[PDB]
């Protein structure tokens with residue numbers, strides 16, 4: 001078996017290898033990349049997402065989210081307080097202000113230490129889930145707005161045609177902005193391109209050990225666990241690497257820099273934080289190997305998770321027994 005220790009693998013495709021997206025995902029998996037839950041892909045030197053990022057300041061962040069923490073430094077939840085709309089230019093200025101800017105630090109490890117020590121004492125503001133793309137339409141390789149759709153994958157594999165669409169989202173972050181422990185909707189893949197700015201540090205649990213993280217989460221957030229059998233779907237819970245280590249949870253970490261892709265694999269729990277002002281673009285996708293994960297994916301039915309239109313068909317076709325209860329949670 002390839003990659004039995006479930007290490008995060010890093011790939012350097014040639015420009016020739018960068019033509020066929022599906023084929024390269026399949027290649028990465030042939031090398032065991034999926035066992036980690038997360039892989040890094042460094043694009044060939046000849047590739048570019050777009051010409052420049054000089055004209056992005058007028059993009060609107062309609063609902064910036066202030067991420068307010070509760071708990072202890074290594075075990076906390078965050079809720080999102082809606083703030084007034086601001087442009088990306090205004091957001092960048094805010095990110096760079098004395099109140100919100102990245103502190104002096106020696107290296108990534110030093111900054112990681114500062115993050116877990118001090119995160120809960122601040123409430124950074126995040127521009128998340130903004131529908132759109134920064135890929136040039138003429139970028140033909142690994143353009144996250146031009147991927148084959150999950151609906152077409154399901155149709156190709158299972159022969160049923162379904163409604164729904166599948167488009168990318170932009171994320172504008174600043175120092176300490178945080179993504180909570182989660183897997184993707186329907187335990188899909190995700191792919192994330194860091195367009196511009198400061199790094200993003202990722203933590204990931206191997207898919208074969210996902211239930212170990214779930215069990216610890218139930219212990220650490222007992223009220224939440226009683227309220228919902230799949231509360232990590234709420235995407236609000238954080239657990240530090242120190243606490244994971246103390247509890248023997250297998251995981252890995254890696255820092256993504258501008259110009260790099262990350263892929264998360266089905267049922268790979270991940271969490272992380274941004275080092276400073278940046279912009280990422282991400283989208284979910286599927287492969288034939290995903291179908292069995294989609295069939296088995298946990299669902300939140302307590303009403304908190306509240307997801308896209310397009311997830312309806314996924315649950316309806318892949319999980320017909322769960323469909324009634326789940327839909328009650330969406331309505």
Ligand SMILES: O=C(O)CNC(=O)C(=O)O
Nearest residue numbers: 171179190191192280282
């Ligand atoms: O970048 C973020 O804030 C969160 N991204 C993801 O969880 C992802 O790409 O799957």
Ligand code: NI
Nearest residue numbers: 183184190264
């Ligand atoms: Ni994700």
Ligand SMILES: [Zn+2]
Nearest residue numbers: 228300302304
């Ligand atoms: Zn729930």
